[PDB]
Amino acid sequence: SFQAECESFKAKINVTNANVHSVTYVPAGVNISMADNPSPITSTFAFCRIALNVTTSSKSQIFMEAWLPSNYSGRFLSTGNGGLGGCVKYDDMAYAAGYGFATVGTNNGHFGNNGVSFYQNTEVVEDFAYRALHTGVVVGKELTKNFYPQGYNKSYYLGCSTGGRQGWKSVQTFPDDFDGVVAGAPAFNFINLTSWGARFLTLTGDSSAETFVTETQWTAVHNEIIRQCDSLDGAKDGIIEDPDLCQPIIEALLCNATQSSTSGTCLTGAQVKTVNGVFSATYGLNGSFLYPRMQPGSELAAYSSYYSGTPFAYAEDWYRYVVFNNTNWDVATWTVQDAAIANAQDPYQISTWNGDLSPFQKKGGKVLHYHGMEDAIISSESSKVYYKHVADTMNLSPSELDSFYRFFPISGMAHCANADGPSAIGQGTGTFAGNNPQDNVLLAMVQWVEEGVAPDFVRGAKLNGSTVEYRRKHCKYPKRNRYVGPGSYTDENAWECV
Amino acid sequence: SFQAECESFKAKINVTNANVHSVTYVPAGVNISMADNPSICGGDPITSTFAFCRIALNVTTSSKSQIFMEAWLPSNYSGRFLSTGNGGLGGCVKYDDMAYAAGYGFATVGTNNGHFGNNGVSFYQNTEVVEDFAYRALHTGVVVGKELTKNFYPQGYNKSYYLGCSTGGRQGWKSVQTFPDDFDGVVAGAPAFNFINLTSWGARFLTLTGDSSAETFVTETQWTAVHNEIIRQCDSLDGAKDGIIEDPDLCQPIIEALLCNATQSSTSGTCLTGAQVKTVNGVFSATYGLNGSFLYPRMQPGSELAAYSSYYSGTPFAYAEDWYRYVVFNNTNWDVATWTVQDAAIANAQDPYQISTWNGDLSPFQKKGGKVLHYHGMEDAIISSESSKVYYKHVADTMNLSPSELDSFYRFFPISGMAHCANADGPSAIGQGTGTFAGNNPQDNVLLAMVQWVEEGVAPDFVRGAKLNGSTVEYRRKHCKYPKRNRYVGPGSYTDENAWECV
Ligand SMILES: *[C@@H]1O[C@H](CO)[C@@H](O)[C@H](O)[C@H]1NC(C)=O
Ligand SMILES: *[C@@H]1O[C@H](CO)[C@@H](O)[C@H](O)[C@H]1NC(C)=O
Ligand SMILES: *[C@@H]1O[C@H](CO)[C@@H](O)[C@H](O)[C@H]1NC(C)=O
Ligand SMILES: *[C@@H]1O[C@H](CO)[C@@H](O)[C@H](O)[C@H]1NC(C)=O
Ligand SMILES: *[C@@H]1O[C@H](CO)[C@@H](O)[C@H](O)[C@H]1NC(C)=O
Ligand SMILES: *[C@@H]1O[C@H](CO)[C@@H](O)[C@H](O)[C@H]1NC(C)=O
Ligand SMILES: *[C@@H]1O[C@H](CO)[C@@H](O)[C@H](O)[C@H]1NC(C)=O
Ligand SMILES: *[C@@H]1O[C@H](CO)[C@@H](O)[C@H](O)[C@H]1NC(C)=O
Ligand SMILES: [Ca+2]
Ligand SMILES: [Ca+2]
């Protein structure tokens, strides 16, 4: 039986410098156990579950899992990580393994979503920057070939945020790891992203500062952005389809004489200047471009991530434990000088900004990149600047890039999750809205790789719990989606990519 | 008789530091003579449509500086005083503007700004000539002009006005910011304020393009392809497919669209290399300096056809070379191609006589009842219109006044379809001079709108402009008061001004 062959496979495993913790059989219809997930998902499929550590240096190691389904498709898949973790993405493992992929995930070289394990340990950094992900691919392919007589044919990657960065690190630096890569909201330009995150507190101050903008004021700011910008795409639907067109004039919210900013409905000049800073690109020494602006429209959730007047953990950790080796360093004191030090350091090219994709192109790889337009954690503009960087570095036009690299801005989408629009594009269980390839980016990538049928658009649904209210076809960049009618803006065919 | 009064005036003038060259009566219907206009400013014509008394004089401003100025005192006098301004690094009296104003009956002045010619060489070794250019020539012309006007007319003058664009727009804003008592009403177009960083931004273009042989260089034909692609991407954002980018802020063009395909070569002029697209992206990028500080906004997309000549042609930019040679470095051999942000930091710290003109606190002018109407064309190839928008926002946030509060005394109107202080292809003729004249209704004539605002309290809620075919008005549009955006909504054609809404 599949089960019996699983439950005695441990003895066959031959991975070097590794410690196999368990080999278990997981039937369909159980909540998958999580005792190895540091301080539930119902399987709809059976699989063989291998958990192990792999040593990656004299001072570092990974934890990883491989999920080898009984209903195996002959395809291998790696998931990735989030933040500064540290945490296997079991949700995405289940998503992929449900489609019959031999699926792996690693902890990225440490446990927990924080940087403390980097302190005085450059090898744990090297794992975070590239090596943990690639190790999980190498070991996962070994396990998969050992378990299934037929081995695997094509290899895929699914990940968002840090996982988006990890997919792009694969494309740029390990072209042979994957045939098809689905990379969302990527944490590439990583050092400058991290700096940009630190910059927010320097602009806002703490909650007592004259520069601070309250949450109710951010809501007013949000509403005024919607007013100025919603209709630019042609549809008055509460959604900024393409924030590039939105260049908001926040001075519209300066208080009139009968109003006080304490009411939350208007802002002072100093407060407006904070908000303008949020909506401005960050430049460094010598006037070099560091990071784009926050795209307008992400305000509600961006209050939680960045604007609340408290230190941004990821940056605090990165600067304390990687940049400066100073556990007491006060992120509020961040400056562009600090950013220049961090950039010079760029450990293991975690920047992940190589624009020359030729090796991956020439080996026949395909990469589908997306980013949400309401992203409150990683500005979508970063992904558009990256696309331009690839085009200009390779000297390849968009229509030439389309042979191997297609990028889809998603309206109405948050950070690796739904927002309030047609965001459910099938990048994971949380964004699932069907199995037609046009509706599911994972299955679109299998179609592109195996049948040559390339995504011209990425269709997303606006869900109400489980019900599809409407869908929209998100355009292939650089085309812009515009509402033209004659039907309602809920009619996908009332939109055109131009 | 007026003519007799003119003929007896020279002997009556007695103004400190003034040497009066001539007082002449000029009838209507004659070419206005140009003996005192040097070759460098075009020498010798404008035909008068009004009679006036013409006073030409020099006024010493230091031991080693002086201005030339004129005052034109019309016989059909309205009781109003007006000063014109200058252009470029000049140096030349704007006689066209003087005739524009004097024909409305203003007692009108202009000065040469402290030297003759549109170039910076009179700055060589002479800070006093720089001071004249930065503020003091214009102000001296006002003080001396008011004295002459009071001396000549029994009734003196009542309100005082300013009309200027480009350098002249900076000059008007310098007045508002630093000489609030000079004018009651100021009409300031496409201003060369943020002057140091404007000049630096001009120097930056060659650093991006290289010369005509560089791999970074984008040819004129390529710039036309870029232009057409920008119109493709951006025309319809305002609602109207009319060939005009109504508000370039919405236009964030993706130049990568013009990367060559595999059968195409950039030598065609129709597509660009990666390096060439990077050049264009730099043109459409803001300039930042040391410590990552904002220096100057991007060039607004849409100005490409004329901006090839002004900036993109692979040749040093004269204004900036002269400014850095004679003012920043005091080295006549300095090579502008070597410009860096460190050079711009030096220049900014120097800021001679606050020529930057960036003061955002207009409280003194507000408190004395002054009004300022500011405009800028959206197709400006010389001074990016974004500079004016950044300035507006700077005033609001520095004064802590909302737009509706500022509306009591300071109103700003982006003008679509307009070039640098001139008509382009759209409804640009707003009455800021002879060259933009489209009638005398105050809503169509910004000079007369200002008279109405100061004297009757009726402020401009919009500035209407005309699209002219020779002297025929094809159509008009009401340009919105910033921050509102003009959007085309129908039901009429985009030529129907009622088919647009300010939002
Ligand atoms: C596996 O490696 C991790 C660091 O990645 C270490 O925390 C852990 O102790 C190791 N063993 C496990 C998870 O059983
Ligand atoms: C200020 O008043 C104007 C004119 O009534 C109004 O349009 C604007 O929204 C007001 N501003 C605030 C912040 O409410
Ligand atoms: C990161 O910012 C630095 C300035 O500190 C700059 O040198 C570098 O180009 C930036 N990198 C990217 C990829 O934006
Ligand atoms: C010219 O003005 C000076 C100073 O006020 C005065 O001394 C002189 O008498 C005046 N000349 C005549 C002819 O009035
Ligand atoms: C007036 O001053 C100018 C300098 O601004 C000088 O060049 C000229 O010689 C002086 N005299 C005349 C008649 O223009
Ligand atoms: C310019 O340099 C000269 C020496 O060549 C010096 O005497 C002068 O003070 C400097 N500055 C000027 C002329 O504004
Ligand atoms: C390159 O080919 C594409 C697809 O045919 C076309 O749309 C695009 O305009 C072409 N690019 C150039 C510069 O002509
Ligand atoms: C001019 O650029 C400099 C860079 O040294 C900056 O300090 C200054 O703020 C800029 N001024 C304006 C008005 O943008
Ligand atoms: Ca919308
Ligand atoms: Ca238009």
UniProtKB/Swiss-Prot annotation, chain B:
Catalytic center residues: 166 (acyl-ester intermediate), 380 (charge relay system), 420 (charge relay system)
Top-rank EC class of the record's enzyme: hydrolase
GO cellular component: extracellular region
Disulfide partners: 6-53, 41-92, 165-421, 234-251, 260-271, 480-502
BP terms from Gene Ontology: xylan catabolic process
EC number(s) reported in the record: 3.1.1.73
Effect recorded for residue 421 to A: High decrease in catalytic activity
Record SUPFAM superfamilies: alpha/beta-Hydrolases
Pfam families xrefs: Tannase
Location relative to the cell: Secreted
InterPro entries documented for this protein: AB_hydrolase_fold, Tannase/feruloyl_esterase
Superkingdom of this protein's organism: Eukaryota
Glycosylation (residues): 14, 31, 58, 76, 158, 197, 261, 291, 330, 469
Reactions listed under catalytic activity: feruloyl-polysaccharide + H2O = ferulate + polysaccharide
GO MF annotation, one: metal ion binding
Keyword Hydrolase listed: yes
Keywords per UniProt: Calcium, Carbohydrate metabolism, Disulfide bond, Glycoprotein, Hydrolase, Metal-binding, Polysaccharide degradation, Secreted, Serine esterase, Signal, Xylan degradation
Record: residues binding Ca(2+): 235, 238, 240, 242, 244
Family note: Belongs to the tannase family.
Description of how the protein assembles with itself and partners: Homodimer.
Note: The calcium ion seen in the crystal structure is located far from the active site and appears to have a role in stabilization of the lid domain.
Function: Involved in degradation of plant cell walls. Hydrolyzes the feruloyl-arabinose ester bond in arabinoxylans as well as the feruloyl-galactose and feruloyl-arabinose ester bonds in pectin.
Protein name: Probable feruloyl esterase B-1
The species this protein was found in: Aspergillus oryzae (strain ATCC 42149 / RIB 40) (Yellow koji mold)
